[PDB]
Amino acid sequence: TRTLWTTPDTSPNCTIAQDKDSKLTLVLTKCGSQILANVSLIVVAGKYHIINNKTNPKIKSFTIKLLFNKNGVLLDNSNLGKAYWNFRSGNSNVSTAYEKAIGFMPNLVAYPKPSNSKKYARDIVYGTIYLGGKPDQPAVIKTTFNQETGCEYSITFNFSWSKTYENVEFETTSFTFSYIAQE
Amino acid sequence: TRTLWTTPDTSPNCTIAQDKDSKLTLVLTKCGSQILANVSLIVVAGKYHIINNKTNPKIKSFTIKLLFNKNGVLLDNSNLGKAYWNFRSGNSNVSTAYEKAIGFMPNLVAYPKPSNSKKYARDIVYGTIYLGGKPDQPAVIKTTFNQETGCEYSITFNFSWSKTYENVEFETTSFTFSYIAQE
Amino acid sequence: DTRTLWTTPDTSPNCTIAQDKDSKLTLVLTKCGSQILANVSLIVVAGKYHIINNKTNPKIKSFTIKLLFNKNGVLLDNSNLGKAYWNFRSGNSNVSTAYEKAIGFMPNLVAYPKPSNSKKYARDIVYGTIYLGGKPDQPAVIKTTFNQETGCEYSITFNFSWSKTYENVEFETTSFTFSYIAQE
Numbered sequence: 303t304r305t306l307w308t309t310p311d312t313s314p315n316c317t318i319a320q321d322k323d324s325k326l327t328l329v330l331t332k333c334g335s336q337i338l339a340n341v342s343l344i345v346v347a348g349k350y351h352i353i354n355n356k357t358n359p360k361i362k363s364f365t366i367k368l369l370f371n372k373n374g375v376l377l378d379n380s381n382l383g384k385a386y387w388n389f390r391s392g393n394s395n396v397s398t399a400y401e402k403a404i405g406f407m408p409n410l411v412a413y414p415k416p417s418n419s420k421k422y423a424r425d426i427v428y429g430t431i432y433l434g435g436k437p438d439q440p441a442v443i444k445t446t447f448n449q450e451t452g453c454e455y456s457i458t459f460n461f462s463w464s465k466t467y468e469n470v471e472f473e474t475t476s477f478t479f480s481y482i483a484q485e
Numbered sequence: 486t487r488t489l490w491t492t493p494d495t496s497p498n499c500t501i502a503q504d505k506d507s508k509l510t511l512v513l514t515k516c517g518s519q520i521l522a523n524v525s526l527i528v529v530a531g532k533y534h535i536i537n538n539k540t541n542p543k544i545k546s547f548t549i550k551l552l553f554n555k556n557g558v559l560l561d562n563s564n565l566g567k568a569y570w571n572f573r574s575g576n577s578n579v580s581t582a583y584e585k586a587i588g589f590m591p592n593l594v595a596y597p598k599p600s601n602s603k604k605y606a607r608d609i610v611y612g613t614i615y616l617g618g619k620p621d622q623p624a625v626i627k628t629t630f631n632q633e634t635g636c637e638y639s640i641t642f643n644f645s646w647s648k649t650y651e652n653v654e655f656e657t658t659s660f661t662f663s664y665i666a667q668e
Numbered sequence: 669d670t671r672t673l674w675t676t677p678d679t680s681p682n683c684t685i686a687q688d689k690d691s692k693l694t695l696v697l698t699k700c701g702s703q704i705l706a707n708v709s710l711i712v713v714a715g716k717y718h719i720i721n722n723k724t725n726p727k728i729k730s731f732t733i734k735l736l737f738n739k740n741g742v743l744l745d746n747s748n749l750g751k752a753y754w755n756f757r758s759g760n761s762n763v764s765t766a767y768e769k770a771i772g773f774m775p776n777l778v779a780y781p782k783p784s785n786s787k788k789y790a791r792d793i794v795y796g797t798i799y800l801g802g803k804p805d806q807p808a809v810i811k812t813t814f815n816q817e818t819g820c821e822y823s824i825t826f827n828f829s830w831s832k833t834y835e836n837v838e839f840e841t842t843s844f845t846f847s848y849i850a851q852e
């Protein structure tokens with residue numbers, strides 16, 4: 303009841319360019335007023351599985367979105383599958399889909415939805431991870447809170463890189479960050 | 486309660502160069518022997534609001550200080566105002582000023598005040614944040630524990646940058662870190 | 669549950685990198701349910717890695733500290749870290765008995781598998797950057813890896829490396845925080 307997660311195995315659960323082309327591992331732990339998060343990505347097939355910027359010069363980034371409703375439940379237009387997201391039960395998930403998780407949503411006062419007033423950057427956290435664990439293959443992970451339309455809350459992970467990679471598999475090291483909770 | 490904060494709104498609470506020229510958003514959450522911290526800065530007026538180093542080549546850094554007494558109560562000569570620094574209640578604060586928060590202070594044995602004993606670097610944490618959320622606009626945030634004089638405990642944030650920015654507004658992305666607690 | 673397992677915050681040598689007790693590893697693990705919040709720093713006080721000079725010794729560029737654990741989450745004598753002051757917390761010191769069980773502090777074996785011939789994925793690694801002497805122009809990379817050592821049930825390995833050419837620099841670092849998925 304204190305941890306929402308994807309389960310840490312290697313089974314594809316996410317759709318970037320084609321159905322089930324990747325495995326997003328994401329763990330959210332409630333430490334009262336802040337949520338502690340840990341994330342990593344493995345692309346298993348399709349367009350982003352093996353990066354070759356000599357063959358495809360413009361393939362330099364992609365986005366994974368998690369959209370939630372007023373009760374903190376995952377919406378189906380998210381890249382991550384609904385069957386794969388729930389409160390932790392041992393090393394798996396609970397049997398039935400959860401009904402409420404408002405205490406895990408990014409705080410709307412710290413991070414407001416888009417509008418006409420001035421937009422601040424505190425709703426963004428930047429980090430860097432490394433492809434295949436290699437020190438010379440960095441890629442940036444930019445995480446933004448509550449900026450998508452069609453939902454009450456959102457968490458989006460944008461992955462991007464500036465080097466010209468030649469035949470590199472897109473599977474990453476892990477990164478931790480935290481954010482202020484709604485309740 | 487488990488959380489000491491500045492509240493998540495954006496009304497000025499801090500004085501860097503002139504009265505209430507900025508909003509420091511700082512959340513301290515107690516997870517046992519460690520404190521989980523989340524910080525961000527928005528400057529709204531004065532000398533550090535808009536940076537132009539072609540015009541003022543020497544404005545390259547500034548500091549924000551938090552000084553506390555033996556009970557963990559904030560001293561009035563801190564750059565952060567005493568008005569809204571308090572334990573959390575919803576998206577605001579408890580009605581009455583707290584009188585004890587020793588469990589939130591940086592540990593004096595891990596981070597000792599200046600003496601003639603050898604000074605170690607472990608009382609420092611470095612992080613990089615981005616102005617306006619732009620990937621090409623980094624600034625470094627250096628956090629130091631218990632090195633100020635005239636107080637039993639202290640937390641100081643130093644912000645600096647090496648690039649020659651032209652009309653860049655100082656408002657940052659968020660950074661998360663942690664430190665060992667006194668009790 | 670919400671306990672702290674640590675090395676104590678003093679500065680008394682407690683770890684062996686190149687010679688006996690040449691360093692002080694300060695490591696604090698706190699349990700927050702299913703994740704462990706970690707905080708680490710290092711002070712080397714003697715030996716080969718105490719004062720770095722890559723003008724006279726260009727090849728001295730990295731070193732490794734390993735913490736090996738058995739099935740109950742107890743530290744094994746062959747770790748670089750000494751068993752004497754690695755224990756649960758009490759005030760600014762430790763409880764009076766060497767611990768029993770700490771499986772709730774061990775890195776998750778499904779998330780981070782032991783070596784085998786199955787594909788090895790990079791998620792069992794966390795990279796961080798720290799600074800020597802607190803100086804902004806002296807970085808070093810700290811690479812942390814989970815469960816990749818043999819001869820144990822679990823492990824946490826810290827590899828320290830640097831690419832700058834240092835000249836007579838003392839290896840004592842700022843602190844870094846990371847987290848990992850707990851076994852239970």
Ligand SMILES: [Zn+2]
Pocket residue numbers: 351471
């Ligand atoms: Zn393949």
Ligand SMILES: [Zn+2]
Pocket residue numbers: 528529534654
């Ligand atoms: Zn402005």
Ligand SMILES: [Zn+2]
Pocket residue numbers: 712713714718838
């Ligand atoms: Zn020394």
